[PDB]
Design a protein around this ligand. Structure first.
Ligand SMILES: Nc1ncnc2c1ncn2[C@@H]1O[C@H](COP(=O)(O)OP(=O)(O)O)[C@@H](O)[C@H]1O
Lengths: 51, 371, 48
């Protein structure tokens, strides 16, 4: 019962995070910067996280 | 960058030694790289361009640091230019990085548009060399004098006060090596090579023909030392198509100063060429590619059969003999089909009779018609 | 085959090549004026 309660609570917590877009890179710009193409807007250069 | 060219081709330990030399050097590369500040500059600039940075297009520059930029939503913004952006690298149509919040110009992005001509920039000449062509010596000296020497050593012409020749037509029966010679000269002098095949500049769209040739010359002059090849110029050469001709002729002769880009145009039906495109002012070098003679045919046989394992009984002369009936491409066809015929009967070592029946069958497939 | 695989290993080890940006000679640019103008002026839109 506690397992289901906990998983529901954490799922509710992550459910607040938004849609995060969808992008496709055309060319990486070395560490961090990296160039990407998103569907409705144009090209951006977006730093990458800890991965 | 690319690997060196190992120039034994028979399986010999010389080939080996060259290879393990190369392995040694690349292994030192691996060693060196595996056996392993400006935070002030970064903290100013790469923090002023706070991530993310959008990509837009520059339209006009109004002040020293003020410019108009459009974005992919199509809106137009008069924004400022930060001092680190190279002004001389900025022009209308240029792709520019912009601050996300305040759209300020924060740098030029190297171009990644105009896809088609970007593809035809090829630059992939290194498959051949003057070595791969044998016997076309007169043609070689002609094209060297016309396009290769002015690129490699313009000093002679500048010292002579000579404005170098600015157009070459290659002609002859097909399979004589016009395309091969163009690729070979592109390889000898590493100037950027541009190839566009004839009819492909003919387009359904009214503007697309002249527009395509204009953008091709634009990219050619952008690469600066460049050679542009139009094979089967006959497709255009022999109102709209004539307007594309006018565009090409004016791009050759007309206003402005063209500079360094060289033009090679290959035709199979030179006599059908219109007088305008063969400009005495521009096209002063016409190079004929005759059907190979006995010496040239022998050279082509050696060049093509060189990479093939051969038996002792092959008497190349009876293959060379008779008359100038065929070209180098036909010779390659004989070599290839002789290889297949040796393969069927299970020879990895082609013999004389293989080439004999190969040339016989090719001559059978060569031309046709009722007696 | 070792030629090919060692080439690929070298390529992955050196990483991709820096495409970079504008960034005129370092002594030429910046000054605090750049950031001050960035935070003080307005990115005007353009209208007919
Ligand atoms: N002199 C030559 N030396 C070597 N190869 C040749 C020669 N002439 C023709 N060839 C062969 O013919 C082909 C090139 O034909 P080419 O005449 O350049 O075509 P096009 O007529 O379209 O210009 C190549 O595959 C090449 O191997």
């Amino acid at each position: 019962l506690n397992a289901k309660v906990r998983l529901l609570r954490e799922e509710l917590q992550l459910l607040q995070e938004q849609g995060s877009y969808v992008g496709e890179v055309v060319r990486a710009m070395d560490k961090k910067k990296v160039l990407v193409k998103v569907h409705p807007e144009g090209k951006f250069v977006v730093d990458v996280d800890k991965n | 960058s690319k690997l060196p060219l190992v120039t034994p081709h028979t399986q010999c330990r010389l080939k080996l030694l060259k290879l393990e030399r190369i392995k040694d050097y690349l292994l030192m590369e691996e060693e060196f790289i595996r056996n392993q500040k400006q935070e002030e500059e970064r903290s100013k600039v790469d923090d002023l361009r706070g991530t993310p940075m959008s990509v837009g297009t520059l339209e006009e520059i109004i002040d020293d640091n003020h410019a108009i930029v459009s974005t992919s939503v199509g809106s137009e913004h008069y924004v400022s230019i930060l001092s680190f952006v190279d002004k001389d690298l900025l022009e209308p149509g240029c792709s520019v990085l912009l601050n996300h919040k305040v759209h300020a110009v924060i740098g030029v992005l190297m171009d990644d548009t105009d896809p088609l001509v970007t593809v035809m920039k090829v630059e992939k000449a290194p498959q051949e060399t003057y070595a791969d062509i044998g016997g076309l010596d007169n043609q070689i000296q002609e094209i060297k004098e016309s396009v290769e020497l002015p690129l490699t050593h313009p000093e002679y012409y500048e010292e002579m006060g000579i404005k170098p020749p600015k157009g070459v037509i290659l002609y002859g029966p097909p399979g004589t090596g016009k395309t091969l010679l163009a690729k070979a000269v592109a390889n000898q002098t590493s100037a950027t090579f541009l190839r566009v095949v004839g009819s492909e500049l003919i387009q359904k769209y009214l503007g697309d023909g002249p527009k395509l040739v204009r953008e091709l010359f634009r990219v050619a002059e952008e690469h600066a030392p460049s050679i542009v090849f139009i094979d089967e110029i006959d497709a255009i050469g022999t109102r709209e198509i004539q307007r594309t001709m006018l565009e090409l002729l004016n791009q050759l002769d007309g206003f402005d100063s063209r500079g360094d880009v060289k033009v090679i145009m290959a035709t199979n039906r030179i006599e059908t060429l219109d007088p305008a495109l063969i400009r005495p002012g521009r096209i002063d070098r016409k190079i004929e590619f005759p059907l190979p003679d006995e010496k040239t045919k022998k050279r082509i046989f050696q060049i093509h059969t060189s990479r093939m394992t051969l038996a002792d009984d092959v008497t190349l002369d009876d293959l060379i003999m008779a008359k100038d009936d065929l070209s180098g491409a036909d010779i390659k066809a004989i070599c290839t089909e002789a290889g297949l015929m040796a393969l069927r009967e299970r020879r990895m070592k082609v013999t004389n009779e293989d080439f004999k029946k190969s040339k016989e069958n090719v001559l059978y497939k060569k031309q046709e018609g009722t007696p | 085959d070792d030629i090919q695989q060692l080439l690929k290993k070298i390529n992955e080890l050196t990483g991709i090549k820096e495409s970079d940006t504008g960034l005129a000679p370092p002594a030429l640019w910046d000054l605090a004026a750049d950031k001050q103008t960035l935070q003080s002026e307005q990115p005007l839109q353009v209208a007919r």
